[PDB]
Amino acid sequence: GSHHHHHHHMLDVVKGNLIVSCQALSDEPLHSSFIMGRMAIAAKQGGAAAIRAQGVNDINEIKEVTKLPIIGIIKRNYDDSEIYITPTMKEVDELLKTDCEMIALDATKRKRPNGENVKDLVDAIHAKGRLAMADISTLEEGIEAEKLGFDCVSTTLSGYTPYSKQSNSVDFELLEELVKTVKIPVICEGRINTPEELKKALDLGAYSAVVGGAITRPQQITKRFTDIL
């Protein structure tokens, strides 16, 4: 198979720039592809180079109204797994029905639903010419992500698995250690609240960074303000 060559490519475009996650799950006040589309427009107009989005309907709305590169995931609980970020081939195939250029998935060491292997998911993604991001919680998971064929790794799940570093602030340590040890792009994702933290992450060698809640979750932004009173 063949297709036409584009001038701009996702990894080149996010390099040293900000990716904005526009996510609002079913228990959140902005749950609606209409609203997540408006959030992406705002992120675009504020200088975001790419968007991270959850669910086929949000992804498709964001792509239409922004034309930005997208990192797509589907979050879904399964009874037989702790994994919820794009846990199976069923979610991978749903995401490949969208135009999102990259698909992130949980690349932790943990057991996946139906006893599926991460390599198969990663191979399915590459088979359709997409990119694969490995959301990880620890340094070894990141090191293994590279070996599995991932195009890039993200610290998304650090502090969100029981065996990774438990923290309320950005895991800069993980970032540094990934940078010493993998060749592929290391993206810093998780609990970036301020411009200073974002600069620090890129200063520490992050290829790019994702900021979600501190831009697109007004409830969380509000809480951070009211917590200080």
Added chain:
Amino acid sequence: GSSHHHHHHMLDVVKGNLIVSCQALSDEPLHSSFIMGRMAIAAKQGGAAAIRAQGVNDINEIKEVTKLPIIGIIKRNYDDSEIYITPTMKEVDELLKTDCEMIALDATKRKRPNGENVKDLVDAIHAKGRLAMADISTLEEGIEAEKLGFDCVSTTLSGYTPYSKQSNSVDFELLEELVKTVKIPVICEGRINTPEELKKALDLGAYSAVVGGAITRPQQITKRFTDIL
């Protein structure tokens, strides 16, 4: 003649607490009464004690989905005045059609459309038993506002009139000076970006404070992140 008594009163409710402004005018990404309603819900669930909203549609939706106390304004240009925050009796009367418990209006030294005076507008607001907030730009405007019987004063317009202090950051100076000289509630409003600034304003004697863009304008939040890169 008379109405039933409520336990909670807007000025009592906001004291020491955060007011969130949920505005998106027609050139902004989140422009939509539905979207402002959801933002207000988020803001509520984050601990906001009241909401400031622009226009009858936004106000009505926000009252409906949050039941929070609302400071209402209409922003509208007139070709015979530089004032746009609730400039005339027209806007006052439209706002009194809503249930908003407080109405903010420009109470600068400047001439209003049609040569209307601010005292008349305040008297109409009081005539229906509502509260009147004075958005000011200077110490003397605040002193005068109190003289006219405004129920509170806000530093909303410091840096948004040519004769007031030009800054890109919170006008703490003005806040301190007003707290020292006026007996009515002084509300810090304009360019609060961090919880640290919020605490500082309350620490300097602000009765309460308003934060808008740093919570509810994702574009301005994104910009602050991308500016640092």
